Symmetry: C2
Subunit: 112 residues, 2 copies
């Protein structure tokens, strides 16, 4: 009724979430402040809260997959982040498996 719309939204939201790490690693192949990444994702049609995004980025930093740097610009300091050599390796692997997954899922859904 509106319950059904709510069910659909949230199942679409789930699908989107799964893809975010990959999108973050991909974006941060160019060094960026978290705020910039936020607007960069929403600009490409992918909404993400700072409250989700920032913990995800630090967790990726703790994995060796992002590295970070402080910029002092008098406004305040802000970190920028960049995908490391290992992060790109991880990204490229996951992406290739994602594509296989998508074709496998597609075929299974098409059994008609």
């Amino acid at each position: 009724a509106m319950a059904y719309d709510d069910i659909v939204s949230s199942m679409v939201l789930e699908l989107r979430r799964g893809t975010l790490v990959m999108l973050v690693l991909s974006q941060l192949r160019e060094p960026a402040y978290g705020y910039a990444l936020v607007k960069s994702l929403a600009d490409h049609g992918i909404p993400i809260e700072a409250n989700t995004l920032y913990p995800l980025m630090r967790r990726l930093e703790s994995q060796g997959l992002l590295a970070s740097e402080w910029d002092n610009g008098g406004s305040k300091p802000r970190k920028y982040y960049r995908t490391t050599d290992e992060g790109l390796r991880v990204l490229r692997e996951v992406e290739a498996q994602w594509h296989v997954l998508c074709d496998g899922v597609g075929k299974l859904l098409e059994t008609n």
Copy 2:
């Protein structure tokens, strides 16, 4: 080292999880016992524990998206489940948005 393999596995595992509800609704367009669905998914290359699968199916039942029936066959009773008219509606919507999502994600990853 093996940490990296573990990071990759789990990011691939995440991607797979997102797709499961859709696969369950799709499979249960033919009535099936949970045990059958378990083996049916692992047969198509998608591993799922009964411990995850069964709560997901009841939650889908509580949404009006699966309905269920008891079979008494003397071994014991077992429920079978089937996708309802609303479930197929929900499935077909999510799937169409999933495809758009995949093409959007693909293009974003290919910016080179």
